[PDB]
Design an enzyme around this catalytic site. Structure first.
Site, PDB file in Angstrom:
ATOM      1  N   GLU A 111       0.791  -1.231   0.000  1.00  0.00           N
ATOM      2  CA  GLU A 111       0.000   0.000   0.000  1.00  0.00           C
ATOM      3  C   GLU A 111       0.817   1.271   0.000  1.00  0.00           C
ATOM      4  O   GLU A 111       0.607   2.195  -0.756  1.00  0.00           O
ATOM      5  CB  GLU A 111      -0.912  -0.003   1.196  1.00  0.00           C
ATOM      6  CG  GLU A 111      -2.079  -0.944   1.059  1.00  0.00           C
ATOM      7  CD  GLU A 111      -3.210  -0.547   0.085  1.00  0.00           C
ATOM      8  OE1 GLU A 111      -3.200   0.527  -0.571  1.00  0.00           O
ATOM      9  OE2 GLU A 111      -4.166  -1.345  -0.030  1.00  0.00           O
TER      10      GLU A 111
HETATM   11  C1  BLG Z   1      -8.731   0.144   3.738  1.00  0.00           C
HETATM   12  C2  BLG Z   1      -9.737   0.940   2.950  1.00  0.00           C
HETATM   13  O1  BLG Z   1     -10.085   2.054   3.332  1.00  0.00           O
HETATM   14  N1  BLG Z   1     -10.264   0.327   1.907  1.00  0.00           N
HETATM   15  C3  BLG Z   1     -11.268   0.877   1.009  1.00  0.00           C
HETATM   16  C4  BLG Z   1     -10.751   0.928  -0.439  1.00  0.00           C
HETATM   17  O2  BLG Z   1      -9.605   1.686  -0.379  1.00  0.00           O
HETATM   18  C5  BLG Z   1      -8.762   1.586  -1.420  1.00  0.00           C
HETATM   19  C6  BLG Z   1      -8.876   2.719  -2.404  1.00  0.00           C
HETATM   20  C7  BLG Z   1      -7.465   2.637  -3.062  1.00  0.00           C
HETATM   21  C8  BLG Z   1      -6.884   3.954  -3.581  1.00  0.00           C
HETATM   22  O3  BLG Z   1      -6.706   5.000  -2.946  1.00  0.00           O
HETATM   23  N2  BLG Z   1      -6.443   3.763  -4.806  1.00  0.00           N
HETATM   24  C9  BLG Z   1      -5.785   4.743  -5.615  1.00  0.00           C
HETATM   25  C10 BLG Z   1      -6.838   5.573  -6.321  1.00  0.00           C
HETATM   26  S1  BLG Z   1      -5.868   6.488  -7.556  1.00  0.00           S
HETATM   27  O4  BLG Z   1      -5.496   5.572  -8.705  1.00  0.00           O
HETATM   28  O5  BLG Z   1      -4.534   6.893  -6.962  1.00  0.00           O
HETATM   29  O6  BLG Z   1      -6.767   7.635  -8.001  1.00  0.00           O
HETATM   30  N3  BLG Z   1      -6.575   2.067  -1.972  1.00  0.00           N
HETATM   31  C11 BLG Z   1      -7.418   1.890  -0.799  1.00  0.00           C
HETATM   32  C12 BLG Z   1      -6.939   0.868   0.209  1.00  0.00           C
HETATM   33  O7  BLG Z   1      -6.327  -0.118  -0.615  1.00  0.00           O
HETATM   34  O8  BLG Z   1     -11.679   1.484  -1.354  1.00  0.00           O
HETATM   35  C13 BLG Z   1     -12.880   0.732  -1.449  1.00  0.00           C
HETATM   36  C14 BLG Z   1     -13.745   1.450  -2.467  1.00  0.00           C
HETATM   37  O9  BLG Z   1     -14.878   2.069  -1.889  1.00  0.00           O
HETATM   38  C15 BLG Z   1     -13.545   0.604  -0.064  1.00  0.00           C
HETATM   39  O10 BLG Z   1     -14.606  -0.348  -0.123  1.00  0.00           O
HETATM   40  S2  BLG Z   1     -16.067   0.040   0.319  1.00  0.00           S
HETATM   41  O11 BLG Z   1     -16.033   1.152   1.259  1.00  0.00           O
HETATM   42  O12 BLG Z   1     -16.651  -1.100   0.991  1.00  0.00           O
HETATM   43  O13 BLG Z   1     -16.836   0.340  -0.872  1.00  0.00           O
HETATM   44  C16 BLG Z   1     -12.576   0.078   1.005  1.00  0.00           C
HETATM   45  O14 BLG Z   1     -13.238   0.131   2.258  1.00  0.00           O
END
Ligand code: BLG
EC number: 4.2.2.n1
Length: 618
Positions: free
Chosen positions: A478
């Protein structure tokens, strides 16, 4: 005096400076002259009254301080201040060569036109114009004196509408078309209509002259209607190909645009045969690979063979596709041919190398490159390394980052190996991973997967069922071990916990003293809310690390839908490899492999998947 005394005066001078006690700051600064971080306090003083700071002072800060990351931001920043001042003769003297920032460059070329170097302004305005991204407000005065000069080419104008529409910037398309070159003024209302409402696209096609511009405008709008209604778009292709005299390769592209939209297990058997026709006729490796992934998550052994074979020779070289050719070969009884492919894959690093050793039942061999026994002086002895030592002392990880980037960036693969080990040895765990990435030192396993925050992962996964290594694997992927990272979209910290998730997790599990999101930048608070969300996600998916990892990244619900499509039909690897989301697919592959390297370093057997994970059906 000494470095330790210097650290208290630095902490103390920052307190007074934040509380605005400027008489105490005034007194205290000249003493801090020899502390590594004194350029930062000078940078702070200068940016504090920038609006009435003279070019002489800024020019000498920058001149004495070349290796310092904020000195470069000050160039681009003082350029825009001289622009606010309208000192165009002072800006060029300050910044004689273009600056690094886009606002800065817009201003730098408007300065060239105000000081008579007009053809230079137009070489700059043309290259700041060829983009569908919206540019800085600064730039709008460049582009109007350019255009007014008669030196703006009318094709350079239409091409920015072509680029804006492709980039989804329907707003820049409307302003652009709104005040248009008189040569094209008859198609200006059609272009505004199409950008507003894409469903007008056939009318656009059947109204304007079919040029390569109008065909690319109609193609991008078409891509939008296939996204609203795939049947509308599918049936619209014969009229569009007619109206615009479309060549065959142009018509194959409209078919791919629709084919992409018919990939679910909710498309009519008429749609499915239409779709597979278009895909069998396509030159697109990505569309064919999505199609292979569809055969895989559906358990279609025949469609797998068929579609795998349609991949370009280049694509068949990819680890996953080399693994699913040996998978099919093993079904057909061609054992030696297949185990040659799995033994070659096992010689590489990563998910499929490890899945292959597990599949034919052999031990995967880890290749870990030894890092040097000496990290000599020069690297380890500079000015920039002393600023890095201090910035880490104060837990200024993102600032330390920028300073480390400059420092590791032009050295040999050996010195970048020494620099990784040095950071590794001072427990600057995110700096170890950064030097490894930077110097591409991919088989230096120690310095890439350091055991960071061990006692805290230990503690916070002791009353939990999630293994410790799987927790450090999630954090490793992460944030690559930087406590202070914040994602684009709001995810914070060591385990990149979203605010909304931190709130619901502290409530389900009844966790005390988490008032605000900023607490997610503390290692221990982030490891506590995070390991709590990961145990929640693990236990509701039967303690399976494929389901918990994709659930932590995309959420519970999206995973539950993916289990609905495959329906007990496929194996673990085919469930992983057929996840319709590129990010989450890549994610499960790295967390499973990284978990194997932490287990290895913790002394247990580095096998990729548990027996209950490998035997389940998906
Ligand atoms: C630990 C955490 O907060 N996880 C959340 C996750 O985060 C992801 C989002 C992602 C993120 O920031 N990705 C990069 C986006 S970008 O490409 O930089 O724009 N990484 C985070 C943890 O792995 O996003 C999904 C989506 O809603 C959530 O699921 S939901 O709430 O049940 O719908 C989930 O709870």
């Amino acid at each position: 005096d000494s470095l330790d005394e210097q650290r208290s005066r630095y902490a103390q001078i920052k307190q007074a400076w934040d509380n605005r006690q400027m008489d105490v700051v005034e007194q205290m600064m000249p003493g801090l002259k020899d502390y590594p971080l004194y350029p930062y306090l000078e940078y702070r003083q200068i940016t504090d009254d920038l609006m009435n700071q003279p070019a002489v002072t800024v020019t000498n800060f920058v001149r004495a301080n070349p290796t310092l990351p904020p000195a470069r931001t000050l160039q681009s920043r003082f350029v825009n201040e001289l622009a606010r001042r309208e000192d165009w003769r002072g800006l060029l003297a300050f910044s004689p060569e273009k600056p690094g920032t886009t606002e800065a460059q817009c201003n730098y070329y408007y300065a060239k036109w105000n000081t008579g170097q007009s053809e230079e302004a137009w070489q700059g305005a043309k290259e700041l114009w060829l983009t569908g991204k919206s540019q800085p407000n600064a730039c709008d005065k460049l582009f109007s004196v350019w255009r007014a000069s008669g030196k703006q080419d009318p094709l350079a104008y239409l091409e920015r509408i072509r680029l804006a529409m492709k980039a989804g910037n329907t707003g820049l398309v409307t302003v652009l078309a709104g005040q248009m070159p008189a040569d094209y003024q008859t198609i200006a209302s059609a272009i505004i209509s199409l950008a507003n409402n894409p469903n007008t696209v056939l009318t656009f096609a059947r109204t304007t002259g079919a040029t390569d511009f109008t065909r690319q405008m109609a193609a991008v709008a078409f891509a939008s209607v296939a996204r609203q209604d795939a049947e509308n778009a599918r049936l619209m292709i014969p009229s569009l190909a007619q109206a615009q005299q479309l060549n065959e390769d142009q018509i194959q592209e409209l078919r791919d645009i629709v084919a992409w939209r018919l990939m679910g297990n909710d498309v009519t058997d008429e749609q499915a045969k239409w779709r597979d026709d278009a895909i069998m006729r396509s030159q697109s490796t990505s569309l064919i690979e999505r199609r292979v992934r569809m055969a895989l998550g559906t358990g279609d052994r025949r469609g797998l063979n068929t579609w795998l074979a349609r991949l370009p020779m280049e694509a068949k070289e990819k680890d996953e596709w080399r693994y699913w050719q040996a998978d099919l070969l093993l079904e057909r009884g061609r054992e030696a041919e297949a185990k040659e492919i799995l033994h070659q894959l096992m010689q590489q690093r990563g998910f499929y190398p490890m899945v292959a050793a597990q599949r034919i039942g052999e031990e995967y061999e880890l290749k870990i490159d030894k890092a040097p026994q000496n990290v000599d002086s020069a690297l380890t002895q500079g000015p920039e390394m002393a600023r890095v030592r201090e910035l880490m002392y104060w837990n200024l990880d993102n600032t330390a980052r920028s300073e480390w980037a400059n420092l590791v960036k032009s050295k040999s693969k050996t010195e970048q190996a020494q620099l990784a080990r040095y950071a590794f040895n001072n427990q600057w765990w995110d700096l170890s991973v950064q030097a490894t990435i930077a110097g591409k030192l991919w088989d230096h396993l120690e310095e890439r997967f350091p055991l960071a925050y061990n006692d805290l992962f230990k503690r916070y996964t002791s009353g939990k069922e999630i293994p410790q290594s799987y927790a450090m694997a999630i954090a490793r992927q992460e944030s690559a071990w930087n406590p202070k990272v914040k994602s684009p979209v709001g995810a914070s910290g060591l385990m990149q916990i979203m605010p909304g998730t931190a709130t619901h997790t502290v409530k389900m599990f009844s966790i005390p003293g988490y008032s605000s999101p900023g607490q997610l930048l503390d290692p221990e608070t982030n490891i506590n809310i995070g390991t709590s969300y990961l145990q929640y996600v693990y236990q509701q998916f039967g303690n399976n690390r494929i389901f918990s990892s994709a659930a932590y990244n995309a959420g519970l619900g999206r995973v539950r839908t993916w289990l609905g499509n495959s329906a007990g039909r496929i194996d673990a690897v085919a469930f992983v490899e057929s996840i319709p989301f590129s990010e989450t697919r890549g994610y499960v592959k790295n967390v499973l492999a990284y978990d194997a390297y932490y287990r290895y370093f913790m002394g247990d057997k580095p096998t990729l998947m548990s027996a209950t994970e490998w035997g389940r059906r998906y």
